[PDB]
Amino acid sequence: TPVKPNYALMFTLAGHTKAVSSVKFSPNGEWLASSSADKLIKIWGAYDGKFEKTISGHKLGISDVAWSSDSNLLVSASDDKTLKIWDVSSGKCLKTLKGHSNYVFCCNFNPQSNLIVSGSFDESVRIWDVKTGMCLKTLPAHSDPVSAVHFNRDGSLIVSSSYDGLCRIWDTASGQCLKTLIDDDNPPVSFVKFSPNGKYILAATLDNTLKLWDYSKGKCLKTYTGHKNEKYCIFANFSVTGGKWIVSGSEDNMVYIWNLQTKEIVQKLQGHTDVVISTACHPTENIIASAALENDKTIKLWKSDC
Amino acid sequence: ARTKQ
Secondary structure (H helix, E strand, O other): OOOOOOOEEEEEEOOOOOOEEEEEEOOOOOEEEEEEOOOEEEEEEOOOOOEEEEEEOOOOOEEEEEEOOOOOEEEEEEOOOEEEEEEOOOOEEEEEEEOOOOOEEEEEEOOOOOEEEEEEOOOOEEEEEOOOOOEEEEEOOOOOOEEEEEEOOOOOEEEEEEOOOOEEEEEOOOOOEEEEEEOOOOOOEEEEEEOOOOOEEEEEEOOOEEEEEEOOOOEEEEEEOOOOOOOOOOOEEEEOOOOOEEEEOOOOOOEEEEEOOOOOEEEEEOOOOOOEEEEEEOOOOOEEEEEEOOOOOOEEEEEOOO | OOOOO
């Protein structure tokens, strides 16, 4: 018999006054962090949906946020051209990272969490030292806005994606390009991420398509379709707490879930009233966090038995 | 601005 999860809405979290841009579960699984165009970052209880606190400081909208390995720090990417490192406990800004000449769009800590990688509209990828806040390297990674940046599991690699239609893998230590995985220019690559085991790369293009690439071989293994995505840089995820699924937001206001192997859509989550720009999968539970744009502004938490 | 096109 075949398996299909049965995610069902547990909570709806309201509070942001503008479209939500990104949601991320703390590695320890107790928190859900959310960023919004309202220039705020809010902290919520992953299991009770209970609002915890608001963290402010950016002068403009935030496009992305990311947790440190110990769930103690948070880094944010904003249109004010800076990234800010925050102490979640106190909610205060520890460092403001300055260098980008345009909107900072994406960010991530490396597994060690002593480094931060950022992607900007200025077309560069920058690597920052967490303790000092100094910029160690600036990579002329692309010829158009950088949509995503992510470290592989041992932190030796960085994967970037861009509107220039490319996906490049970089050597963290040297900052040199190890490979241009997606070579065609156009369609815009709106999102990239390494698989939990660091062997694959999940990439989304603005042609309603998600693809699983075998990094070492440089070849496409799986394609996932059926959802809508031609306008926004939507976050996509690997779900491995139960059945191995591919999770993603969509421009038709729903959350799509695919069987990773068969590539078949196994469930579509309804409830949001606007584009689901971001989705996140709990690190230990079969829980999904989803967030929507302007006509919704809410974050929904879903749970299944798998 | 990830929220805008």
